[PDB]
Design a protein around this ligand. Structure first.
Ligand code: 5KR
Length: 123
């Protein structure tokens, strides 16, 4: 209940970005979800996530998880546990975190607000 930022894995974004730790199962809040421009291929969704301290904009949902967005269980403000993810590095050096398995712990409606005051992580 109280101490809302205590619901999130503070420091997980830095851990993912700095250490490349993939064994952790961090709890993050969805701040925003947006489709990416795609061709005739399945839609892809990019997420702005928060660990309470930082936000990071380079999350992508694995296509297998698209139903979570399209049926609305995964939406802005919800709190999720990431059970499996990988990091991929693009030609230009940018890294993207692909969310492969995730659990919605609290619905957007049950949370209702951005938790804490996270600031953008500097990639
Ligand atoms: C469009 C697209 C889709 C997918 C991947 C990707 O890296 N996929 C994977 C890579 C490795 C393993 C698994 C996967 C997986 O998707 O399951 C990259 C791109 S992109 O670079 O051309 N544009 C883009 C990148 C990031 C963000 Br935020 C927004 C747009």
């Amino acid at each position: 209940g109280s101490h809302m930022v205590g619901q999130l894995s503070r420091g997980a974004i830095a851990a993912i970005m700095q250490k490349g730790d993939t064994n952790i199962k961090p709890i993050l809040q969805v701040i925003n979800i947006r489709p990416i421009t795609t061709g005739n291929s399945p839609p892809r969704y990019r997420l702005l996530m928060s660990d309470g301290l930082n936000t990071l904009s380079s999350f992508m949902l694995a296509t297998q998880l698209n139903p979570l967005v399209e049926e609305e269980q995964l939406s802005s403000n919800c709190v999720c546990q990431i059970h499996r993810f990988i990091v991929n590095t693009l030609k230009d050096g940018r890294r993207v975190v692909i969310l492969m398995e995730l659990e919605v712990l609290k619905s957007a409606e049950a949370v209702g607000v951005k938790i804490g005051n996270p600031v953008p992580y500097n990639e």
